[PDB]
From a paper:
Human feline leukaemia virus subgroup C receptor-related proteins 1 and 2 (FLVCR1 and FLVCR2) are members of the major facilitator superfamily. Here, we show that FLVCR1 and FLVCR2 facilitate the transport of choline and ethanolamine across the plasma membrane, using a concentration-driven substrate translocation process. Fully conserved tryptophan and tyrosine residues form the binding pocket of both transporters and confer selectivity for choline and ethanolamine through cation–π interactions. Our findings indicate that both FLVCR1 and FLVCR2 operate as uniporters, facilitating downhill ligand transport independent of sodium or pH gradients.
We determined structures of FLVCR1 and FLVCR2 in as-isolated (without exogenous addition of ligands), inward-facing conformations at 2.9 Å resolution. The inward-facing conformations of FLVCR1 and FLVCR2 exhibit a close resemblance to each other, with a root mean square deviation (Cα r.m.s.d.) of 0.993 Å. Both structures feature a wedge-shaped solvent-accessible cavity that is mainly created by the separation of TM4 and TM5 of the N domain from TM10 and TM11 of the C domain. Although FLVCR1 exhibits a similar extracellular hydrogen-bonding network as FLVCR2, it lacks a corresponding salt bridge interaction. Notably, the disruption of the hydrogen bond between N133FLVCR1 and N359FLVCR1 (structurally analogous to N110FLVCR2 and N332FLVCR2) through an alanine substitution of N133FLVCR1 markedly diminishes the transport activity of FLVCR1 for both choline and ethanolamine. Of note, although the as-isolated, inward-facing and outward-facing conformations of FLVCR2 represent apo states of the transporter, we observed an extra non-protein density within the substrate-binding cleft of the as-isolated FLVCR1 structure. Introducing choline and ethanolamine to FLVCR1 leads to displacement of this unidentified molecule, evident from the altered size and shape of the specific densities for choline and ethanolamine in the respective electron microscopy maps. The precise nature of this ligand remains unknown. It is, however, conceivable that FLVCR1 is copurified with a blend of choline and ethanolamine, creating an indistinct density for these ligands or alternatively with a yet-unidentified ligand.
Numbering used by the authors: 100 to 516
Write the structure that this text describes.
């Protein structure tokens, strides 16, 4: 007896909404990083670390959290993901002062820990609550909810918080309003999670989950899985190319305010819409990419073409910022964003196919961990280059690294799909 419960829409909607808030909080500081420079009396390096602890905290905590999710259940991970997101947001609301940067540093640390319990959920929620035909779209919706958070995170903070650096009292009110609004939304979603997020439906929704429910997962071993994934060389190369592709997206998103503001002074609002275009277009590309793979070509050919086009994406983007035309940044940012974050569906689906005899829990974790490691290195490197030799030097650094990504992608041997 397998049936679909109406609660699955509520569970999916609740998770997508508090995934939006957590992803909103990752980029809310970086998009107005020039505002927080004068508010805290703090250099750009610390403000970049606000968006980078989202990546630093993910690397060590991903696998113990996956162990917690695979052993305790969906509800505890959901409660911890929303609970720490709500707790991290509430700490920030008390950090709106000129001498309390560590308080907002501590608050962002909790949100980064919350992301560990959020990013691994979308694949599990669809496979537990949704029937066989709707697993793919339910999984896609949850990830798009996280990407939609970045889109809102790019657009709203510039609107909510103007520069107003010559009036600190008025500046403090706007920052507190954004923090108060973020915590209030996160608190409501945590309350809903504690109420509506059931552990599992009354009956399994799919035939595969009914069979899988009878098998205890205590026989799994994470040490064997990670060690076995580095033995085969095709996956190691893909772990690097995906990290470069996704890490470049994190580096650009974190430093988008710095590159835009030096050429266009006072256009921090427009930098938000460029960030929105850079990721909304990727959402369109991600949807189109999913319908693209099983319609014309194979995984290897498609992932090389997108990577080649993604490299061309910033080559035009690198050499169009200096043109001093704001319209050109919108189009080039969208074209670059159509392929930068349109590759993540390609990265995940390519890896899971070439890793059949190994569980997708670790392969997905390693790919995300690879993105965090490269995102930290790129932001640290591009941040110094931009702050010293101009944004063109910083962007060329990313262009060089995708050239390595194209070469490494071409060396992968695969024929699946």
């Amino acid at each position: 007896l397998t049936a679909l419960s109406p609660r699955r829409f509520v569970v999916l909607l609740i998770f997508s909404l508090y995934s939006l808030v957590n992803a909103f909080q990752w980029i809310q500081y970086s998009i107005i990083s020039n505002v927080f420079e004068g508010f805290y009396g703090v250099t750009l390096l610390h403000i970049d670390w606000l968006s980078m602890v989202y990546m630093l905290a993910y690397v060590p905590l991903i696998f113990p959290a996956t162990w917690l999710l695979d052993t305790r259940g969906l509800r505890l991970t959901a409660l911890l993901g929303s609970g720490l997101n709500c707790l991290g947001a509430w700490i920030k609301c008390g950090s709106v002062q000129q001498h309390l940067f560590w308080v907002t540093m501590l608050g962002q640390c909790l949100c980064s820990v919350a992301q560990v319990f959020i990013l691994g959920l979308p694949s599990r929620i669809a496979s537990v609550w949704f029937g066989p035909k709707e697993v793919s779209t339910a999984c896609a919706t949850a990830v798009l909810g996280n990407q939609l958070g970045t889109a809102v995170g790019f657009l709203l903070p510039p609107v909510l918080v103007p520069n107003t650096q010559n009036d600190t009292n008025l500046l403090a009110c706007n920052i507190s309003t954004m923090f108060y609004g973020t915590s209030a939304v996160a608190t409501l979603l945590f309350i809903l999670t504690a109420i509506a997020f059931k552990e599992k439906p009354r009956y399994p929704p799919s035939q595969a989950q009914a069979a899988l429910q009878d098998s205890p997962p205590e026989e799994y071993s994470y040490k064997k899985s990670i060690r076995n994934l580095f033995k085969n060389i095709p996956f190691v190369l893909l772990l690097i190319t995906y990290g470069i592709m996704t890490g470049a997206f994190y580096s650009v998103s974190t430093l988008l305010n710095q590159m835009i503001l030096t050429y266009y002074e006072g256009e921090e609002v427009n930098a938000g819409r460029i960030g929105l275009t850079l990721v909304v277009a990727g959402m369109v590309g991600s949807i189109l990419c999913g319908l693209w793979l099983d319609y014309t070509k194979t995984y290897k050919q498609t992932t090389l073409i997108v990577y080649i086009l993604s490299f061309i994406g910033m080559v035009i983007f690198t050499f169009t910022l200096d043109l001093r035309y704001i319209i050109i940044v919108f189009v080039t940012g969208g074209v670059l964003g159509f392929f930068m974050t349109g590759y993540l569906p390609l990265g995940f689906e390519f890896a899971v196919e070439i890793t059949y005899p190994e569980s997708e829990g670790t392969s997905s974790g390693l790919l995300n961990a690879s993105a965090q490691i490269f995102g930290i290195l790129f932001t640290l490197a591009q941040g110094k280059l931009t702050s010293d030799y101009g944004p063109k030097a910083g962007n060329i650094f990313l262009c060089v690294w995708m050239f390595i990504g194209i070469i490494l992608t071409a060396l992968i041997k695969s024929d699946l799909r």
